[PDB]
Design an enzyme around this catalytic site. Structure first.
Site, PDB file in Angstrom:
ATOM      1  N   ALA C  93     -37.705 -19.464  39.764  1.00  0.00           N
ATOM      2  CA  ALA C  93     -38.835 -19.298  40.667  1.00  0.00           C
ATOM      3  C   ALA C  93     -38.491 -18.414  41.852  1.00  0.00           C
ATOM      4  O   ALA C  93     -39.400 -17.962  42.558  1.00  0.00           O
ATOM      5  CB  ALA C  93     -39.323 -20.661  41.155  1.00  0.00           C
ATOM      6  N   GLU C 177     -37.579 -21.092  53.740  1.00  0.00           N
ATOM      7  CA  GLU C 177     -37.452 -22.543  53.661  1.00  0.00           C
ATOM      8  C   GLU C 177     -38.642 -23.301  54.230  1.00  0.00           C
ATOM      9  O   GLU C 177     -39.078 -24.269  53.585  1.00  0.00           O
ATOM     10  CB  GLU C 177     -36.164 -22.988  54.366  1.00  0.00           C
ATOM     11  N   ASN C 200     -26.776 -30.270  54.723  1.00  0.00           N
ATOM     12  CA  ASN C 200     -25.455 -29.672  54.582  1.00  0.00           C
ATOM     13  C   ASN C 200     -24.773 -29.446  55.923  1.00  0.00           C
ATOM     14  O   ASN C 200     -23.544 -29.486  55.995  1.00  0.00           O
ATOM     15  CB  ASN C 200     -25.559 -28.347  53.835  1.00  0.00           C
ATOM     16  N   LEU C 246     -33.041 -51.360  43.145  1.00  0.00           N
ATOM     17  CA  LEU C 246     -33.777 -50.289  43.809  1.00  0.00           C
ATOM     18  C   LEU C 246     -35.136 -50.760  44.299  1.00  0.00           C
ATOM     19  O   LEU C 246     -35.640 -50.268  45.323  1.00  0.00           O
ATOM     20  CB  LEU C 246     -33.931 -49.107  42.856  1.00  0.00           C
ATOM     21  N   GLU C 248     -35.702 -53.586  45.632  1.00  0.00           N
ATOM     22  CA  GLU C 248     -35.440 -54.138  46.953  1.00  0.00           C
ATOM     23  C   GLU C 248     -35.306 -53.035  47.992  1.00  0.00           C
ATOM     24  O   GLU C 248     -35.766 -53.191  49.128  1.00  0.00           O
ATOM     25  CB  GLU C 248     -34.190 -55.006  46.918  1.00  0.00           C
TER      26      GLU C 248
HETATM   27  N1  LIG Z   1     -25.374 -30.057  49.279  1.00  0.00           N
HETATM   28  C1  LIG Z   1     -25.393 -29.040  48.430  1.00  0.00           C
HETATM   29  N2  LIG Z   1     -26.476 -28.193  48.406  1.00  0.00           N
HETATM   30  C2  LIG Z   1     -26.499 -27.158  47.544  1.00  0.00           C
HETATM   31  C3  LIG Z   1     -25.440 -26.943  46.685  1.00  0.00           C
HETATM   32  N3  LIG Z   1     -25.721 -25.857  45.946  1.00  0.00           N
HETATM   33  C4  LIG Z   1     -26.931 -25.385  46.315  1.00  0.00           C
HETATM   34  N4  LIG Z   1     -27.416 -26.174  47.314  1.00  0.00           N
HETATM   35  C5  LIG Z   1     -28.710 -26.022  47.986  1.00  0.00           C
HETATM   36  O1  LIG Z   1     -29.494 -25.116  47.250  1.00  0.00           O
HETATM   37  C6  LIG Z   1     -30.239 -24.293  48.111  1.00  0.00           C
HETATM   38  C7  LIG Z   1     -30.351 -22.916  47.480  1.00  0.00           C
HETATM   39  O2  LIG Z   1     -31.571 -22.812  46.793  1.00  0.00           O
HETATM   40  P1  LIG Z   1     -31.853 -23.778  45.548  1.00  0.00           P
HETATM   41  O3  LIG Z   1     -32.596 -25.015  45.966  1.00  0.00           O
HETATM   42  O4  LIG Z   1     -30.548 -24.103  44.870  1.00  0.00           O
HETATM   43  O5  LIG Z   1     -32.756 -22.904  44.566  1.00  0.00           O
HETATM   44  P2  LIG Z   1     -32.551 -23.144  43.002  1.00  0.00           P
HETATM   45  O6  LIG Z   1     -32.099 -24.554  42.735  1.00  0.00           O
HETATM   46  O7  LIG Z   1     -31.559 -22.142  42.480  1.00  0.00           O
HETATM   47  O8  LIG Z   1     -34.014 -22.887  42.405  1.00  0.00           O
HETATM   48  P3  LIG Z   1     -34.711 -21.470  42.671  1.00  0.00           P
HETATM   49  O9  LIG Z   1     -35.113 -21.397  44.116  1.00  0.00           O
HETATM   50  O10 LIG Z   1     -35.939 -21.323  41.814  1.00  0.00           O
HETATM   51  O11 LIG Z   1     -33.721 -20.376  42.366  1.00  0.00           O
HETATM   52  C8  LIG Z   1     -29.476 -24.247  49.415  1.00  0.00           C
HETATM   53  O12 LIG Z   1     -30.374 -24.413  50.484  1.00  0.00           O
HETATM   54  C9  LIG Z   1     -28.532 -25.422  49.362  1.00  0.00           C
HETATM   55  O13 LIG Z   1     -28.919 -26.365  50.325  1.00  0.00           O
HETATM   56  C10 LIG Z   1     -24.350 -27.793  46.708  1.00  0.00           C
HETATM   57  O14 LIG Z   1     -23.407 -27.609  45.951  1.00  0.00           O
HETATM   58  N5  LIG Z   1     -24.329 -28.846  47.583  1.00  0.00           N
END
Ligand SMILES: Nc1nc2c(ncn2[C@@H]2O[C@H](COP(=O)(O)OP(=O)(O)OP(=O)(O)O)[C@@H](O)[C@H]2O)c(=O)[nH]1
Ligand SMILES: Nc1nc2c(ncn2[C@@H]2O[C@H](COP(=O)(O)OP(=O)(O)OP(=O)(O)O)[C@@H](O)[C@H]2O)c(=O)[nH]1
Ligand SMILES: Nc1nc2c(ncn2[C@@H]2O[C@H](COP(=O)(O)OP(=O)(O)O)[C@@H](O)[C@H]2O)c(=O)[nH]1
Ligand SMILES: Nc1nc2c(ncn2[C@@H]2O[C@H](COP(=O)(O)OP(=O)(O)O)[C@@H](O)[C@H]2O)c(=O)[nH]1
Ligand SMILES: [Mg+2]
Ligand SMILES: [Mg+2]
Lengths: 435, 429, 435, 429
Positions: C93, C177, C200, C246, C248
């Site tokens: 997407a 975002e 994060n 869950l 609960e």
């Molecule tokens: N905590 C954590 N967050 C991650 C990690 N890898 C990716 N993310 C999160 O993923 C976001 C990047 O965009 P995604 O939500 O992964 O997008 P996607 O899952 O690839 O799906 P598309 O947007 O369609 O490409 C970042 O804002 C990170 O917060 C991880 O290993 N740990």
């Protein structure tokens, strides 16, 4: 179960703490890594313990220059300390009280108080505080004033003992000692329960004359002061025939709220080669303690009046001999207490003998006595500082650093007024009553 | 931590800096390639205060070498201990200041100062917690004087909090290596008393005399003098580059030695200084060093201290020693010379002690005296200036770059104000 | 016999799942190939089993970009997953909610629901769902909104837990975002049983300060969150002195239907070198959990009110100490619950200690506690998003992608209105009652 | 999957493409014969995105090389890394555009465009799930500009869904390699703002300056510049040609960097750029790269960013690194340059991270900034155009192919509309 934390501020504080914790670890048979291969618990008062056989000190090492703390982290006592206790700054106050009390220390004081509160809450029968700090250094004076104010705000009525290093009348390593000393005293005068005057000049004299070491290092003075402090806390940390707590110290040695500056003295201090040829009589060592040449502040006690005395004995001591020696001391003329205090002694007796550190300089003795004496001669010392201050203030020397670092001139005038008032009170006590 | 940045302006600055970095690397056990081959961890425990750890485990000096001509720059670059500097730091011009201060501060320097400040800023951002800057330059040569003053003004604008050190080679009293050096000296002193935290006055004449008389060398090449001054600076910084029983830093020295903002000019001194044969025939005792550091014949500024008073004094030792010994020596030396000190400053000796000797020796010592004798120097210069300004000799050379007579008028007025203050505090009561 | 499937949407979901399933396989002694050389069945709740000694997870890995799923198929956990669970799209997407909810995901949603229904019907005592998804990514937000709507339509009343990744206030890897976050929240607000806020930025801070790792990789954060989730489901998957399901969780931590956004926190988190020097008291670790610096959402809890708390303990835990620690927490002032909820705690105790992953960063601890806390400070965070949205909407920036990909502007206005209404409800709860 | 098709128009396009495919093959370990001799499976896990596996286990680039003259085509064909292209792709004409845009878009191009579109369609049908197209061309030369615009219009007619990239060599501000390039540039920009998803403005002047100053090369041959631009493009695509901790694709970049349909012009940049000797003397740290990518002296478009605002910013790293480090660096760089960013777009940095370095290095980085500074470029061009159009110089050359004055009138009007929009969004509040 009667805990008492230790706080070491400034380079002097940290080095003294190194010596003191070496001495403690030797006392309780504790390895540098916290392991251990009459005793009660005893070490519980200063050592906390985890699940394993590893014990840690209840100490806080705070400094603004990471040099000495890094040395500690690299020192042989590396595994001992819990790493969070080693709070290090980035830029030392550089013998500037303003930096150490307004600019730099103000930004780590919160973390320091946090660790203090953690260690306090982990303990149960907290007796009080032990502060180890110099007087001239910027970190010492500034951070100590700030810390005492914060602690008094937080922990209202608990023991707060201090170990200042009174700047010598003639040996002044720094140049701005009077300014920092006056400021820190004017501040701490309203918070400290009881200070403990010690000076390096007197310790030099004692090391040369008695121990017969002509060229001493700071390590030796640190060993001496560590022995003193160990004698101070042996009552808490050991079983004695007449025990005593820090609360008793502050009660007995402080007649008036402002006048709480007792000086230290210890005996016996003789070389191991000279260990023989003298039986170390209890009356003998008492007289040694009372001799003006064995005191650890360069002030002739015959110029003042002993408002209070506290003699703490450890080792093979018998109460009747102590009573006899104290009576003999009271008989002598040159020791003239204030008329209004006819009872000028509190005594403490312990069974544990003092321990001599291998690689040390003193000799294994069966008995030892530490005297904490609050006298009137100390007033004269203040006068000297007063004098110097006026000089360095009559020309406004060095003022610009302090001004530009968060301070005002009226504060200096106020500190001078407060020191003058303290000297006035000392004189007022020095007089005798009518009727 | 407390990272220090080094600036070298002018030919003298660059040569002194080359010798200095040689000495520092020798202290830390650093190969000419810039990689570490040393033996003691304490070398690398604080290597970061002066060096930067470049990747692949190499070390580069945190220095900034500045010039207006490629000659001495290239000379250093070709020489050993040159291939370790990061080449991007070698900023140099083509016109050359022509030993003129006006060029070095208005016309020629104004074109390179921007790039110099950019490299300065980059290095500052690389550092974690900046301590301060040390500038190595002269006061006679046009480039050193002018460009150093310009950079000092700019930096103090960009860093009103950090600390600033200057190691200026003051013109000798008797000889005069150039002709127009009074003008450059006066203007440089003007800018220094404006915006410098501390200034280390040094003369080549005193170094000549020390090398000849004390060390018994009739053939002193400039390498020797630069080696001596570099040893002095290294001894100044070793108090923080290494542990110590009573450690000190630049900030402590500034606090202790500068009672008033303008009066921040210091004469240095070093000890022990022994010949090659006459060394074993003397005991290397703390009293010996102490008495050595207090006499006219061992001051790196050509002015007898007995002509004035020691306003303040700092002393940094090295190696293992007994503190009580030092205390007693300082006490005795302050007692015996009672007439030579300021009355209203009791106990006017700052003491620092290190744990490492400067190699080869058991114990060394460095003295930094702020006295009232040095005013004579300024007096001398002032007089000369007036002479050369009364007939307006050479005035056109400086005029042609935009400077005007009122500039010299103000600078001389400021210098005489400083002299008046120095004399006033000399006979204070 | 109480099953609960796992659903991983988006790159974040898949990587977190990698970590979580590594942790699970370590917990039950399961090889990557499903073989295995206090325990009950236990693993039956998350592992299904075939005839042989081979077990498979009850998980679904769905993504629109085949990169990460292909990495999984090539990962060391290759033989583990049933190949049909690895649903891969063709074009991601691309951080566009419209694509992830209208165009692309709409064409594989049916297959995803089919696999979901297969795994549901193969199970018997299905407790509910676990959704692992980010918030900013297009696939995450879009596909998650679609999936939640579909599941709520199909499985009416079953547990639906979500693990969003709240976008940091300052560290925003994407640029759009706010748009995706607002849309996905406005949609999921009417379907999700209970979310779990984690960010994060807070995990970076925790890793640097506590674990003393200055340069962490995403693997480390994934390990942390996997530990949290394992603590969450240990009650189902293990025998404890006071177990909890869950159901609960959702009952206790959700006072009002809309306000179901509790944030996570875990303890203890210390380095193995720092494992000693602290006994890890249960009250100590409770205080650690309640410290604002140990929370996993960048929001000062002192700015809000804890509407509910849920503390889950595992390891050598004793109920009386838990009671004492909770009472002490209630005594403190800066923790001010809502007046109308005097009972602000649900407790859970397990016997199985937390397991440390070899090659990990944490240290083997005997006790652990995870706090899921629903507070009021989280409201402020919404405000920030609100702000940003308005900005990016005041100039109609980036709108054309969303418009041209199956959306209308009135939808954006409606989402903004819904977020404003939620913030209004948060404020309304924040007030105190009269009479 | 996500197969990408490459088009190369004009002499510059063909040369850049030749260097580009050289670089790509070097990344994937592909022999000059076109067969694989590499060592890591990940090379062939996504080899299909750019290559097609011809039978007998060979690989061919999915490129389409276009020209109106056989010269450079044959030059490439004879050269190494030429014998791997499938020969049927070499479409070329005989007349030559004569550096005229009218020929390249109306008369001469209209005869080859059909065959070109046929080959395009064949390649599209060969692909499984098409991702998009990347066009490599100039804006001055007649062939590149005109035929590329024509092909872009036709493709966008046949594919209103796919993604489109253009790597156009914008004319330099100071020098002018041709004489009539303002006309071709204006018309090409007209067609691009019509039907392009994103455009990567690049200047030869900036590349000259980077090669000379930063890399310390006084002899930059066109091979070097094409080498650099190809490295940039490869770094752009590596986010999908290889796994990554935070992967990105062309679609993500288009979404993040194009807030408004017309404002899709980007200035690229690359890091690190070190000399051959001055490399080991610097630490290869993420903060270093980050600070390197933000300055005028490292932008491949000749326009100081400080003159405008960074509307959006994208950054693609490679190799193993710590995400928190990147996050902190982006935070700091956005904080310190607060005046240089758009107010109403908070957190305007897109981040992507790969797992493979571009060979030889530990960690690299690519920057794609959409700023308001670039408008100056257009402004400049616009002015020039008006001048050359006021006297109607050279107007007959373009007139003779059917084009009329109203064409230029409309194109200039459109350009000024775009400039007005750019300025409007620069000072938005
Ligand atoms: N905590 C954590 N967050 C991650 C990690 N890898 C990716 N993310 C999160 O993923 C976001 C990047 O965009 P995604 O939500 O992964 O997008 P996607 O899952 O690839 O799906 P598309 O947007 O369609 O490409 C970042 O804002 C990170 O917060 C991880 O290993 N740990
Ligand atoms: N008795 C004793 N005193 C010491 C020792 N080491 C340092 N000191 C005292 O420390 C003083 C030097 O200044 P400090 O108080 O240490 O200053 P600091 O602790 O480094 O803090 P800053 O002033 O901010 O640098 C001297 O006056 C000594 O009296 C020691 O080993 N034993
Ligand atoms: N002590 C010392 N002084 C030097 C040395 N080299 C040059 N000088 C002094 O530097 C001055 C010349 O300044 P210079 O830097 O060469 O001229 P500039 O280019 O205008 O700055 C002379 O007065 C010398 O006394 C050296 O090696 N040691
Ligand atoms: N960066 C770069 N630009 C080039 C190169 N070769 C040609 N150019 C540019 O391409 C333009 C010439 O266009 P060209 O394709 O030869 O003319 P056309 O046949 O009409 O398309 C000139 O402005 C050059 O700046 C190259 O190798 N690198
Ligand atoms: Mg200090
Ligand atoms: Mg995705």
């Amino acid at each position: 179960m009667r805990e008492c934390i230790s706080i070491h501020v400034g380079q002097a504080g940290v080095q003294i703490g190194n010596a003191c914790w070496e001495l403690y670890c030797l006392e309780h048979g504790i390895q540098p890594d916290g392991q251990m291969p009459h005793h009660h618990d005893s070490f519980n008062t200063f050592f906390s313990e985890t699940g394993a056989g590893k014990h840690v000190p209840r100490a806080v090492f705070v400094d603004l220059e990471p040099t000495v703390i890094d040395e500690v982290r690299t020192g042989t006592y590396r595994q001992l300390f819990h790493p969070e206790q080693l709070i290090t700054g980035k830029e030392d106050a550089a013998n500037n009280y303003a930096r150490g009390h307004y600019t730099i220390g103000k930004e780590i004081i919160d973390l320091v108080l946090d660790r203090i509160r953690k260690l306090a809450d982990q303990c149960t029968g907290l007796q009080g505080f032990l502060v180890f700090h110099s007087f001239g250094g910027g970190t010492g004076s500034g951070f100590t004033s700030l810390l005492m104010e914060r602690l008094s705000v937080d922990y209202g009525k608990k023991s707060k003992l201090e170990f200042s290093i009174y700047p010598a009348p003639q040996v002044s390593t720094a140049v701005v000692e009077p300014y920092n000393s006056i400021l820190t005293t004017h501040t701490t005068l309203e918070h400290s329960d009881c200070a403990f005057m010690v000076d390096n000049e007197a310790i030099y004299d004692i090391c040369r004359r008695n121990l017969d070491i002509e060229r001493p290092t700071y390590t030796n003075l640190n060993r001496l002061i560590s022995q003193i402090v160990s004698s101070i806390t042996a009552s808490l940390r050991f079983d004695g025939a007449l025990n005593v707590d820090l609360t008793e110290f502050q009660t007995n040695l402080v007649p008036y709220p402002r006048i709480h500056f007792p000086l230290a003295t210890y005996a016996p201090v003789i070389s191991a080669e000279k260990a023989y040829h003298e039986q170390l009589s209890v009356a003998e060592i008492t007289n040694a303690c009372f001799e003006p040449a064995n005191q650890m502040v360069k002030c002739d006690p015959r110029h003042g009046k002993y408002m209070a005395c506290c003699l703490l004995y450890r080792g093979d001591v018998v109460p009747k001999d102590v009573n006899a020696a104290i009576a003999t001391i009271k008989t002598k003329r040159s020791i003239q207490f204030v008329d209004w205090c006819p009872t000028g002694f509190k005594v403490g007796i312990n069974y544990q003998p003092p321990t001599v550190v291998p690689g040390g300089d003193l000799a294994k003795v069966q008995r030892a006595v530490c005297m904490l004496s609050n006298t009137t001669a100390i007033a004269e010392a203040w006068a000297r500082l007063d004098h110097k201050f006026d000089l360095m203030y009559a020309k406004r020397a060095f003022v610009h650093w302090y001004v530009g670092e968060g301070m005002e001139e009226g504060e200096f005038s106020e500190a001078r007024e407060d020191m003058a008032a303290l000297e006035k009170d000392y004189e007022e006590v020095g007089v005798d009553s009518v009727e | 931590m407390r990272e220090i940045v080094h600036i070298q302006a002018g030919q003298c600055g660059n040569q002194i800096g080359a010798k200095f970095w040689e000495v520092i690397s020798d202290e830390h056990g650093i190969d000419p390639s810039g990689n570490y081959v040393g033996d003691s961890d304490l070398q690398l425990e604080r290597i970061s205060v002066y060096y930067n750890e470049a990747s692949s485990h190499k070390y580069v000096p945190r220095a900034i070498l500045v010039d207006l001509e490629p000659g001495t720059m290239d000379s250093v670059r070709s020489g050993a201990f040159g291939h370790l500097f990061r080449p991007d730091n070698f900023i140099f011009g083509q016109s050359g200041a022509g030993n003129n201060w006006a060029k070095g501060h208005y016309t020629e320097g104004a074109e390179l100062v921007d790039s110099v400040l950019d490299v300065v800023r980059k290095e500052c951002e690389n550092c974690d917690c900046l301590q301060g800057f040390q500038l190595t330059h002269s006061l006679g040569g046009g480039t050193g004087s002018g460009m150093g003053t310009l950079l000092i003004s700019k930096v103090r604008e960009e860093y009103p909090d950090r600390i600033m050190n200057t190691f200026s080679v003051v013109p000798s009293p008797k000889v005069s290596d150039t002709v127009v050096e009074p003008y450059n000296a006066t203007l440089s002193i003007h800018q220094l008393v404006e915006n410098t935290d501390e200034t280390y006055c040094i003369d080549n004449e005193a170094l000549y005399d020390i090398c000849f008389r004390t060390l018994k060398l009739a053939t002193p090449t400039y390498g020797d003098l630069n080696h001596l001054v570099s040893a002095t600076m290294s001894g100044v910084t070793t108090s923080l580059r290494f542990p110590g029983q009573l450690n000190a830093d630049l900030r402590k020295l500034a606090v202790n030695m500068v009672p008033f903002p303008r009066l921040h000019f210091f004469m240095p001194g070093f000890a022990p200084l022994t010949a090659r044969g006459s060394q074993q025939y003397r005991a290397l005792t703390v009293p010996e060093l102490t008495q050595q550091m207090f006499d006219a014949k061992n001051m790196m500024a050509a002015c007898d201290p007995r002509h004035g008073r020691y306003l303040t004094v700092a002393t940094v030792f090295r190696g293992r020693m007994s503190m009580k010994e030092v205390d007693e020596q300082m006490l005795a030396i302050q007692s015996k010379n009672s007439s030579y000190f300021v009355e209203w400053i009791p106990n006017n000796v700052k003491v620092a002690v290190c744990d490492i000797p400067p190699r080869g020796l058991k114990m060394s010592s460095t003295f930094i005296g702020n006295s009232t004798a040095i005013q004579e120097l300024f007096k001398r210069i002032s007089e000369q200036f007036t002479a050369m300004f009364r007939r307006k000799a050479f005035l056109h050379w400086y005029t042609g770059e935009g400077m005007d007579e009122m500039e010299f008028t103000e600078a001389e007025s400021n210098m005489n104000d400083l002299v008046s203050e120095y004399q006033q505090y000399q006979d204070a009561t």
